Amino acid sequence: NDADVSKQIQQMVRFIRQEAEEKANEISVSAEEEFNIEKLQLVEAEKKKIRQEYERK
Amino acid sequence: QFKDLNSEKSPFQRTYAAQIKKCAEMARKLRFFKEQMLKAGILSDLEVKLGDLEAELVEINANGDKLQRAHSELVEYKLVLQKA
Amino acid sequence: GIQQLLAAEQEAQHIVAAARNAKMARLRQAKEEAEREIAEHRAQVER
Amino acid sequence: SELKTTLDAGLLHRGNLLQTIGDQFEQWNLLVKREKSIYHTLNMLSLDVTKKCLVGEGWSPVFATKQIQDALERAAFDSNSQVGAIFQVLHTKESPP
Amino acid sequence: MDHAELTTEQVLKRDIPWETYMTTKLISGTGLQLLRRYDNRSESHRAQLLDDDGPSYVRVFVSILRDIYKEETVEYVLALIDEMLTANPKRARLFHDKSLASEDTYEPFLRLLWKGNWFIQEKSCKILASIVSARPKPQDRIDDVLKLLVEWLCAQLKKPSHPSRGVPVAINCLAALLKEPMVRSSFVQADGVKLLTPLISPASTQQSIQLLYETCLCVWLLSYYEPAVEYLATTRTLPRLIDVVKSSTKEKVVRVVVLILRNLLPKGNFAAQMIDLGLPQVVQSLKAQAWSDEDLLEGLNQLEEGLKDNIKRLSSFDKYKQEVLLGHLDWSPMHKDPLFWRDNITNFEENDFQILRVLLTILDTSSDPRALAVACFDLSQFIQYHPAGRVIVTDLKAKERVMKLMNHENTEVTKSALLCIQRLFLGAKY
Secondary structure, rough: OHHHHHHHHHHHHHHHHHHHHHHHHHHHHHHHHHHHHHHHEEEEEEHHHHHHHHHOO | EOOHHHHOOOOOOOHHHHHHHHHHHHHHHHHHHHHHHHOOOOOHHHHHHHHHHHHHHHHHHHHHHHHHHHHHHHHHHHHHHHHO | OOHHHHHHHHHHHHHHHHHHHHHHHHHHHHHHHHHHHHHHHHHHHHH | OOHHHHHHHHHHHHHHHHHHHHHHHHHHHHHHHHHHHHHHHHHHHEEEOOOOOOOOOEEEOOHHHHHHHHHHHHHHHHHHOOOOOOOOOOOOOOOOO | OOHHHHHHHHHHOOOOOOHHHHHHHOOOOHHHHHHHHHHHHHHHHHHOOOOHOHHHHHHHHOOOOOOOOHHHHHHHHHHHOOOOOHOOOOHHHHHOOOOOHHHHHHHHHHHHOOOHHHHHHHHHHHHHHHHHHOOOOOOOOOOOHHOOOOHHHHHHOOOOOOOOOOHHHHHHHHHOOOHHHHHHHHHHHHHHHHHHHHHOOOOOOOOHHHHHHHHHHHHHHHHOOHHHHHHHOOOOOOOHHHHHOOOOOOHHHHHHHHHHHHHHOOHEEEEEHHHHHHHHHHHHHHOOOOOOOOOHHHHHHHHHHHHHHHHOOOOHHHHHHHHHHHHOOOOOOOHHHHHHHHHHHHHHHOOOOHHHHHHHHHHOOOHHHHHHHHHHHHHHHHHHHHHHHHHHHHHHHHHHHHHOOOOOOOOOHHHHHHHHHHHHHHHHHH
C-alpha cells in the first residue's frame, strides 16, 4: 500500500475524469451536431416546399 | 512467473490469446523462414517484412528451378536435333 | 481499494448511458426546434 | 544457355539477400522468443476491466521483490502513461516453490 | 482545460490599479469607480440583482477593454470580465447581454484580440461564444474579423508560453464554433487547417497525444462542414494521419481517427485509395488490435466493411455480371484485361465451362450484333486466356457464336466473332 494504494486511487480518479468524460462529451457533441444538421436539412426541405406553395399562390 | 489462470479458464482466445494466435502465426512464419535459411546457410511489421522476404526468396527459388528445367528441356531438344 | 475501481467502472458506465440519453434527447428537442423555426420563417414569408 | 544464366543470376541475388535475411532472422530468433514469451505471459495474465490494467500474480522472492519497482518504473516511463502500476504482496496459505 | 487554467492564472496574477491609470489621463474616474464597484456587482449577481451586475457592466467592460489597450492593465480588466465572458451560462445575465444580438456580440470584437495569451484565452472564448450563434456573428461582425486578425495564428505560434497553451484553446474554440456551420466552414478555419497539416502527422509526446485528440476533434468538426471537408482534401498528411492512427498507443485516439474516416463517407479518391492501402493492413491490424470500447470496435468493424465495399468500386464484379451473367452483353472487366479474363473464366469453367456454356448459348442466338460483339469479344478473351479452354469454347456454342455474324454487315460483331474463332483455333493446337 502506502504510495501503491494512493497511486492506484489516483489512477482510478484519472480514469473516471479523463476516459469517461472525453468519450462521453465527444459522443454527445457529435450526436447533437449531427441531429441539428439533419433536422435543419429537413426543415430546409420543408421551407423549399413552402416557398413553392407561396410561389403558386 | 504467472500461472495460466485465463488459459485454464479457456484455452480458446483466453483473454489476450488472440494476440497469442497472431504471435503464433508470426512464429510459424519465422520458423519457416529459419528453415529456409538453414537450407541456404545464412548466419542464423517486422514479421510481415520477414514473411514477404521469405515469400520472395521462395518465388525466386521456384523461378530458378523452373528455368533450370526449361534449360534441361532445351538442351534435350538441341541434343536430339543435333543427333538427327 | 478494489471497491474504488468497481465504483469507477460503475460511474463510467453511468456516464456513458447519460451521454447516450443526452444524444437522444438532443435529437428529439432539435426536431421540435427546427419545426418551430420553419413555422416562423413561413410566417415572415407570408408577411 | 540464356535461361540457365538468368536462373543462376537470380539464385546469386537471392543468396546475397538471404545472407542479410538470415542475420535479420538470427536477431529475430531472440525477437520471436521474446514475443512468444510475452504472449504466453499475457495469456497467463488476467485483464481487469474495472482497473483497466491486466492483473499479474506470480511467486517472487520477498527480498528480491524490492527490485521489481525499477522494471515497473522503466516500463511506465517507456509507456509514458500517467497511470502507475502497483505491485503488492499477498499473504496466503499457498506455499510458493 | 490546462491551457485555460494557466492563462487565467497568469492573467489574475498581475494586478493593475485602474485609479492610477485613470489619473494618468488614460482612463476616467467613473471607470475607476465602476471597476471598484464590479465586486459588488458580482456579489449582486450572486444575490440576483441583474441590473447592477451585468446590464451596465457589459458596456462598462467594453469601455474598459477599449480604453485599457495596454496588455498590463488588460490583464486585470480581462480577469475581472472573465466571469461574464467565460460562457453563456457563467454569469448568465451579463453573458446574455453580451451575446443577446449580433450588435452586442460584435461589440466584444473590439475587446477581442487584445493583450497577451493570458487574456487571449478569454478573448478566444468570447469570440467562440459570439461565433457559436451564427446570427450573433455576422461576416462583418465574425469570419472576416477572424481571418484578418492573425492574432489567432500568433497565439498558436506562441511556443515559449507552453506546448499547448494557444493550441488547446484554439482547438476548443474551433470545436465550439463547429456548432455554427458558417464558423466551421469559414476560410479562416480552413486556412489554419493547411497550416496545421504537419501537426497531424506526429504525436510522439504524451502532450502530443492530447494534441492528437485535439486534431481528431478538429477532424470531426471538418467532417461536419462540407467546405471544411474540401479544405481537408486539399490539406495533406491524410496518409500520415492514417499511419499515425495505425501506430496509436491511445485506443481512444485510434477510435477517434476511425470515426473521422467513417464520417468521411464522401469519396475523396486520394484518401479512399490510402484507406484501401490501409484496409489491407491498418484495418486488419485494428481488427487484430481490438481494444477499449466494444462500441468503438463495432464501429471499426462497420468502417472496415464499408471500406471493403468501396474497394474496387469501379473495378467491381458488377460490370461482369451485367455483361456475361445478365445475358445482354456489355462492358465487362474480363474483356478489359487478360488477367481479369482468366479470373472470370475460373468461375465460369466449373463443369465443362457451365457458365461459359451459358454465355455461349446466349451469344449464339443474339439478334443484336452489338451485344453479340461484346459477347464474342469476351469469349475471345476467355479462349486466349487458356489454350485448352479455347478448345472447350470451340466445343461449346462459342464456335457457334463465332460462326453467327462472322462476316455480317456489322464490322464489330464480325471482328469479335473472328477473334473468338481464332483464339479457339490457337488454343486447339500449340
